[PDB]
Structure formats: C-alpha cells, structure tokens
Design an enzyme around this catalytic site. Structure first.
Site, PDB file in Angstrom:
ATOM      1  N   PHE A  11       0.781  -1.245   0.000  1.00 33.36           N
ATOM      2  CA  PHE A  11       0.000   0.000   0.000  1.00 33.36           C
ATOM      3  C   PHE A  11       0.819   1.306   0.000  1.00 33.36           C
ATOM      4  O   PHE A  11       0.848   2.023  -1.015  1.00 33.36           O
ATOM      5  CB  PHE A  11      -0.964  -0.008   1.218  1.00 33.36           C
ATOM      6  CG  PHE A  11      -1.874   1.202   1.300  1.00 33.36           C
ATOM      7  CD1 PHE A  11      -2.957   1.358   0.425  1.00 33.36           C
ATOM      8  CD2 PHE A  11      -1.676   2.162   2.273  1.00 33.36           C
ATOM      9  CE1 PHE A  11      -3.848   2.474   0.565  1.00 33.36           C
ATOM     10  CE2 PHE A  11      -2.541   3.269   2.416  1.00 33.36           C
ATOM     11  CZ  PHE A  11      -3.625   3.424   1.564  1.00 33.36           C
ATOM     12  N   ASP A  12       1.514   1.585   1.116  1.00 35.70           N
ATOM     13  CA  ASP A  12       2.269   2.826   1.273  1.00 35.70           C
ATOM     14  C   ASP A  12       3.387   3.014   0.234  1.00 35.70           C
ATOM     15  O   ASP A  12       4.230   2.152   0.050  1.00 35.70           O
ATOM     16  CB  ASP A  12       2.831   2.922   2.703  1.00 35.70           C
ATOM     17  CG  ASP A  12       1.737   3.023   3.745  1.00 35.70           C
ATOM     18  OD1 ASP A  12       1.620   2.100   4.627  1.00 35.70           O
ATOM     19  OD2 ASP A  12       0.966   4.011   3.714  1.00 35.70           O
ATOM     20  N   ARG A  55       6.954   3.375  16.328  1.00 35.26           N
ATOM     21  CA  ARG A  55       6.390   4.615  15.723  1.00 35.26           C
ATOM     22  C   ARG A  55       4.966   4.870  16.199  1.00 35.26           C
ATOM     23  O   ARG A  55       4.636   5.998  16.501  1.00 35.26           O
ATOM     24  CB  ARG A  55       6.428   4.548  14.189  1.00 35.26           C
ATOM     25  CG  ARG A  55       7.851   4.617  13.597  1.00 35.26           C
ATOM     26  CD  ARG A  55       7.888   4.266  12.100  1.00 35.26           C
ATOM     27  NE  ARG A  55       7.789   2.800  11.870  1.00 35.26           N
ATOM     28  CZ  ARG A  55       7.447   2.228  10.719  1.00 35.26           C
ATOM     29  NH1 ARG A  55       7.153   2.971   9.655  1.00 35.26           N
ATOM     30  NH2 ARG A  55       7.385   0.900  10.638  1.00 35.26           N
ATOM     31  N   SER A  98      -0.707  -4.836   3.456  1.00 42.80           N
ATOM     32  CA  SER A  98       0.037  -3.694   4.010  1.00 42.80           C
ATOM     33  C   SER A  98       0.351  -3.761   5.495  1.00 42.80           C
ATOM     34  O   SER A  98      -0.504  -4.178   6.298  1.00 42.80           O
ATOM     35  CB  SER A  98      -0.821  -2.422   3.774  1.00 42.80           C
ATOM     36  OG  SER A  98      -0.342  -1.218   4.445  1.00 42.80           O
ATOM     37  N   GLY A  99       1.559  -3.316   5.838  1.00 35.76           N
ATOM     38  CA  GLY A  99       1.945  -3.220   7.243  1.00 35.76           C
ATOM     39  C   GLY A  99       1.365  -1.936   7.806  1.00 35.76           C
ATOM     40  O   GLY A  99       1.634  -1.535   8.972  1.00 35.76           O
ATOM     41  N   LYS A 143       3.646 -11.002   5.010  1.00 32.51           N
ATOM     42  CA  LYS A 143       3.100 -10.825   3.658  1.00 32.51           C
ATOM     43  C   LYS A 143       3.151 -12.093   2.801  1.00 32.51           C
ATOM     44  O   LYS A 143       2.229 -12.388   2.041  1.00 32.51           O
ATOM     45  CB  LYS A 143       3.782  -9.648   2.968  1.00 32.51           C
ATOM     46  CG  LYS A 143       3.391  -8.315   3.647  1.00 32.51           C
ATOM     47  CD  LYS A 143       3.663  -7.097   2.716  1.00 32.51           C
ATOM     48  CE  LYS A 143       3.463  -5.740   3.454  1.00 32.51           C
ATOM     49  NZ  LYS A 143       3.502  -4.560   2.461  1.00 32.51           N
ATOM     50  N   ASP A 170       8.234  -6.290   2.164  1.00 36.27           N
ATOM     51  CA  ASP A 170       7.649  -6.943   0.990  1.00 36.27           C
ATOM     52  C   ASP A 170       8.561  -8.099   0.609  1.00 36.27           C
ATOM     53  O   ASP A 170       8.247  -8.858  -0.310  1.00 36.27           O
ATOM     54  CB  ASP A 170       7.529  -5.991  -0.187  1.00 36.27           C
ATOM     55  CG  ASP A 170       6.584  -4.875   0.114  1.00 36.27           C
ATOM     56  OD1 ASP A 170       5.529  -5.168   0.666  1.00 36.27           O
ATOM     57  OD2 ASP A 170       6.880  -3.702  -0.159  1.00 36.27           O
TER      58      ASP A 170
HETATM   59 MG   LIG Z   1       5.615   0.438   0.966  1.00 39.98          MG
END
Ligand SMILES: [Mg+2]
EC number: 3.1.3.3
Length: 210
Positions: A11-12, A55, A98-99, A143, A170
């Site tokens: 995603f990101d 984070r 996604s993480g 993943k 990934d």
């Molecule tokens: Mg990414």
C-alpha cells in the site's frame, strides 16, 4: 478459459503516494522522528514489527479527528485505478497487503475495487489513539503468508502470482511470488526483484504481465 493470476500490491508509497504512518505522525508532532524510523524499516535496517510498534507509540493520545485529517491527504499513485481495472479486465484477482492501517487501506480497497485487503489496525479508546497497533501484517514473513493464503483460497498456483512492492517488509511476499516487481523501491528489495520500475506510474507494471 485462460487461467487467472493473483497480483498483490504493497500500500504505502506503492498504491498511494504517501506513507500513512508518517502522515499521522505529522498530526501528532513527531514527523521527523517517525519518518526516520520508517525509512530505516523500509531499508531493512530494523525489525518491522518493533519499528512499527515504536512509531505508533509516539502517536499516543492523538484524537481520531486528527488521524482522519492525515488520512485525507493520502492520494492514489498515478495510474492506480486504470492498472487495477485492466488487471480485473483480464479476469485476475487483485489484493493489497500492508503493514499499514485498515483506516486508510479499507478506503482504497473500495475506491479502487480490490478483491482483498489486509492491514494492521490502530487501537482507539475514548476517541483517541492509545498508541498500540495489532494485526496480522507484522511478522517478518507475514506478507508471504498472506500471499500463500489468498492463492490457496483462489485455487491459483504460486507460479501465477505477482508481487508489486517497495519496502523491506515486501521481501517475504517476493519469496513466494511467481514474478517480483520492485516499484520505485528501496535497494534491499530491488536486489531481490525480477523487475525494477523507477517511473512513478503503476501502469508501467502491465508491460511485464501477460
Ligand atoms: Mg511500501
């Protein structure tokens, strides 16, 4: 009667231009520190789960309204919907793994018309983030585990899967995938990719997929 392929996207910075966690960090007043850890995590310098929990904890007490303000700045990468529609047009299955967080990922799943979406979740209490995160896209091989699970549900052989990613989390998805595409990716993933795209347009992946 042709066979379907399963295509998974990170995603990101891949499906969307932004890093969700860094955008929320801006609202919590810890952008610089979070951005730095994100960069190290994506470069493979840190354990993913430990880096994410670290984070997210810096986001403790941020009201849910400020989280949404950060999510609203997230934009789809050039070519994203056209690329997803063309893949579906071929009868293929498409997923985002996604993480990052459901709060951002769920939206894009519906906006772009994806078949599957897997992400972690920010814990919320009394209308504010508690600073915790939980989910199934945390462990180092998470993943890849999800790619195998989706492929099994769909009856698709691993040789017929494609992983499009850009960060070190990934890497486990690449290990299981039939074709590995690094999209404007960090060096640690480019080393492991079959193909590296550096033009920021998701339609560039279509050249490599039958
Ligand atoms: Mg990414």
């Amino acid at each position: 009667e042709k066979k379907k392929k399963l295509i998974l996207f990170d995603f990101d910075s891949t499906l969307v231009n932004n890093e969700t966690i860094d955008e929320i960090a801006r609202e919590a007043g810890v952008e610089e520190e979070v951005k730095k850890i994100t960069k190290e995590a994506m470069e493979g310098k840190l354990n993913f789960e430990q880096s994410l929990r670290k984070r997210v904890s810096l986001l403790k007490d941020l009201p849910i309204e400020k989280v949404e303000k950060a999510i609203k700045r997230i934009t789809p990468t050039e070519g994203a919907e056209e690329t997803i529609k063309e893949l579906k047009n071929r009868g293929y299955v498409v997923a985002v793994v996604s993480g990052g967080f459901d709060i951002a990922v769920n939206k894009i799943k519906e906006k772009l018309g994806l078949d599957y979406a897997f992400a972690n979740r920010l814990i919320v209490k009394d209308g504010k983030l508690t600073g915790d995160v939980e989910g199934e896209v945390l462990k180092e091989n998470a993943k890849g585990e999800i790619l195998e699970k989706i492929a099994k549900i769909e009856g698709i052989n691993l040789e017929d899967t494609v992983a499009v990613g850009d960060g070190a989390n990934d890497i486990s998805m690449f290990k299981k995938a039939g074709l590995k595409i690094a999209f404007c990716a960090k060096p640690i993933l480019k080393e492991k990719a079959d193909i590296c795209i550096e033009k920021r347009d998701l339609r560039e992946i279509l050249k490599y997929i039958k």
